[PDB]
Amino acid sequence: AESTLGAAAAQSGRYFGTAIASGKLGDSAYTTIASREFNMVTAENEMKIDATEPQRGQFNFSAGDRVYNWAVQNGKQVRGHTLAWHSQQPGWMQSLSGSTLRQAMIDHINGVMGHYKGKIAQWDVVSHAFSDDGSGGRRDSNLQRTGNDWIEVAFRTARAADPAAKLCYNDYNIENWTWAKTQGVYNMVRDFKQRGVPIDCVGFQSHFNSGSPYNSNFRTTLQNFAALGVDVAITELDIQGASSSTYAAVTNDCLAVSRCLGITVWGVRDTDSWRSGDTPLLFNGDGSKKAAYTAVLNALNGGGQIKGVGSGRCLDVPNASTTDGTQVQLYDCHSATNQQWTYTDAGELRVYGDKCLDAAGTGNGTKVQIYSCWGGDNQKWRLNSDGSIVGVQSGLCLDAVGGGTANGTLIQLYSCSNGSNQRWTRT
Numbered sequence: 001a002e003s004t005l006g007a008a009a010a011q012s013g014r015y016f017g018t019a020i021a022s023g024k025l026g027d028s029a030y031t032t033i034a035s036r037e038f039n040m041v042t043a044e045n046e047m048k049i050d051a052t053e054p055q056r057g058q059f060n061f062s063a064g065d066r067v068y069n070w071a072v073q074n075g076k077q078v079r080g081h082t083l084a085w086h087s088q089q090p091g092w093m094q095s096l097s098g099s100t101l102r103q104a105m106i107d108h109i110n111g112v113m114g115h116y117k118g119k120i121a122q123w124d125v126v127s128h129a130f131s132d133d134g135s136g137g138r139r140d141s142n143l144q145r146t147g148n149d150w151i152e153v154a155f156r157t158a159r160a161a162d163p164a165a166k167l168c169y170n171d172y173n174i175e176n177w178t179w180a181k182t183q184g185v186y187n188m189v190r191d192f193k194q195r196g197v198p199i200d201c202v203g204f205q206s207h208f209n210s211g212s213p214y215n216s217n218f219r220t221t222l223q224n225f226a227a228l229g230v231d232v233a234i235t236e237l238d239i240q241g242a243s244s245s246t247y248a249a250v251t252n253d254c255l256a257v258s259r260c261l262g263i264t265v266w267g268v269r270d271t272d273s274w275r276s277g278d279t280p281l282l283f284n285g286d287g288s289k290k291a292a293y294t295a296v297l298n299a300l301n302g303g304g305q306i307k308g309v310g311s312g313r314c315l316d317v318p319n320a321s322t323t324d325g326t327q328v329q330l331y332d333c334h335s336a337t338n339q340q341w342t343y344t345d346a347g348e349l350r351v352y353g354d355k356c357l358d359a360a361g362t363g364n365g366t367k368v369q370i371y372s373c374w375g376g377d378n379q380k381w382r383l384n385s386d387g388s389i390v391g392v393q394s395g396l397c398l399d400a401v402g403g404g405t406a407n408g409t410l411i412q413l414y415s416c417s418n419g420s421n422q423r424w425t426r427t
């Protein structure tokens, strides 16, 4: 199978997952996409400490079980998270400290893991334990104040609680190999493996934006950790603006590491994101697949002028016009700027540098023209492996009107048909 993300990843023994919010399971649009595209689920908040143990010794798995059951019933494995960390702690735990906090941490781990014993693929036992001050040291938290060995203890407790689950340490800003934080985690994990501390995986949040940009050395980081004898997982992937190249790059980084179990994007649609303003996911709020979706699918499947297959002619802007609203056409291919299209990270097909292939509407027969670039979804396109070019907003294919092949044949949007007048080659 290769038409959905999860299935595409499965071809190499990997998964492609998402974060599921129990509060959205009653949303048909949400579940239709989530059940179809992902084969791994992480509860966005339902399995955290405050959600599972609202009162000391009083566990509640109502929300957690709804996410877990939805996942398994729809064919997805589950990553549990998170058993012990400084954030989202219930009020009672925040006030605890020292030895009492240490015991509370242990009791929580046993309670939650015991409830899901043998049903969880991976557990983020500890998360976000290192600082961002640039010292590569531990984060100052109530948990850290109970002893630097709290993390080690958490893992030993976890292994005993459920020996069938892979135990992971998860964190962010540990993707770039040159950062001190990355080194701090690397050294801790190396020490753990050397001393026999039970740890099976390292999770990389992979939250990329201009403040903490993706860097190609992420692959090196993954490979260095894999070399320590642990699996690695991309746990909360999201990319500011959802750059197609960056999404494909991260996808290929996991594919390049034998021990990379899979990739989880932090949310289904941009509107479901904890950082929606950065439209960092693979689906738009209206459910349409973004340019990055196709880039990722293509990568998982192991994947200038734009020439029509049926006509042998090139996508051309009539008389090299730069006027907004000029409908594009098919024309004999030749070296000219009005036939030179550039596919951008945002999914646009640009010409002249700042003009965009633009759909004047959303239905069959819609005029395809050039228009000033502004970021609209009617200016975004997905380059399918079969040669078709689909509009993100419309879901319709670039189509040479009436199947025409002669110079002057206009271009429109039309229901995809796999026809030769809808197939294009880029060379």
Ligand SMILES: *[C@H]1OC[C@@H](O[C@@H]2OC[C@@H](O)[C@H](O)[C@H]2O)[C@H](O)[C@H]1O
Pocket: 044, 045, 082, 127, 170, 205, 236, 274
């Ligand atoms: C990685 O970062 C994102 C965390 O998830 C968010 O936590 C805060 C919630 O308010 C928000 O809804 C969640 O998406 C995740 O737990 C971390 O591991």
